[PDB]
Amino acid sequence: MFSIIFIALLILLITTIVMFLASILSKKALIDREKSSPFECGFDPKSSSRLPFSLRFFLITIIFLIFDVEIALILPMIIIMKYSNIMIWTITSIIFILILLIGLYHEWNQGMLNWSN
């Protein structure tokens, strides 16, 4: 850790210096009211980008939060296979992956994995 943090800072300093060189090495010209205008294919923009952007994969978005938190429970598997009771480890692991598949196929069949339409 403490080694990694030091190099993490050292890299961040180095990368930071890079633009601090770029900001000075960059040619400097007077900024225009149009030069800094946004790019939207050369025609002025109708709509701010900060309007509410509708969402259609919201349902998947929530399911993503869940499925990760079961990744927290499969990852330890390997580490404790040499040390655990094989029946308990075998049984539980399987009924862990079957539960996941059944959940997935259930929603897939119910059509929730499809986007809002």
Partner 1 sequence: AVQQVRPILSVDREEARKRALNLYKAWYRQIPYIVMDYDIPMTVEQCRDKLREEFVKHRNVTDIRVIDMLVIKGQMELKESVEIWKQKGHIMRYWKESQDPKPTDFLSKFIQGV
Q: Which of 15, 105, 106, 116 binds ligand 3PE (CB under 6 A)?
A: 105
Cβ neighbours of residue 38 closer than 8 Å, sequence gap 6 or more: 45, 49
CA neighbor of 49 nearest in space, from 58, 57, 38: 38
Contacts with partner 1, residue ranges (CB under 8 A): 33, 43-44, 46
Cα-Cα end-to-end distance for the chain: 48
Closest CB to ligand 3PE: residue number:
111
Cα–Cα separations (whole angstroms), residue 95 to 74, 89, 90, 98, 102: 12, 10, 9, 5, 10
User: Between 4 and 43, how does the x/- string for binding to ligand 3PE read (CB under 6 A)?
Assistant: xx--x-----------------------------------
**Closer residue to ligand 3PE (CB): 3 or 85:** 3
Considering beta carbons, is residue 6 or 20 the nearer one to ligand 3PE?
6
| Comparison of 22 and 30: residue with beta carbon closer to partner 1 | 30
What ranges in the chain are assigned the alpha helix state H?
A: 2-25, 58-74, 86-110
Residues that bind ligand 3PE (CB under 6 A): 1, 3-5, 8, 105, 108-109, 111, 114
